[PDB]
DNA sequence: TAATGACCACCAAT
DNA sequence: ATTGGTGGTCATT
DNA sequence: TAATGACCACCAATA
DNA sequence: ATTGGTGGTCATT
């Protein structure tokens, strides 16, 4: 899982740079860098977007992730 | 709102209380010695909460942001 | 003209 | 059977 | 247990 | 109309 060394040491095309547990920094051409959160509710995926980088840290995307983690385990 | 500093220097009571931050977050500060941190939300009219966890452990800064996705989550729809 | 939410595919490992 | 990683698309705000 | 999710009354503040 | 802030309770695990 990253560190906030690897993200600015980065570089095309969007990609996804994966944090853990569906979490992950979607970077496009423009310098558009936006955390996103892959998961699933009762069987269908979405994401929910937790804000853009590096105004929002990565301790922060992961403590956003966190919250959502014990909303949606219920259920 | 809340601060650090304010949580730091609680009085000890007899009772449970809870102490605001914003947007429905607190810390409930039991006779014990616990402190916990809940969010107050509704889902469609229905009152509940979740439990985001045990001061110090998760700092003031990590429960805003744990209400800040939840929030984003709560606001579908 | 961006960003967001809602997905697709395959796949490995829990 | 479900999530998470790699790598994408597309419609709705 | 002590902590959690659900959810009560009363009202002030957002919206 | 809906939430957020007091200040509580209750039954499971």
């Known amino acids: 899982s990253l560190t906030d060394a690897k993200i600015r040491t980065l570089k095309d095309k969007p990609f996804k740079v994966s944090d853990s547990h569906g979490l992950y920094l979607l970077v496009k051409p423009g310098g558009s860098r936006h955390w996103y959160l892959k998961y699933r509710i009762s069987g269908k995926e979405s994401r929910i977007a937790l804000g853009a980088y590096?105004?929002?840290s990565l301790s922060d995307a992961?403590?956003?992730?966190?919250?959502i983690r014990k909303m949606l385990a219920l259920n």
């Open 54 to 56: 590096p105004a929002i």
């Open 62 to 67: 992961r403590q956003q992730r966190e919250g």
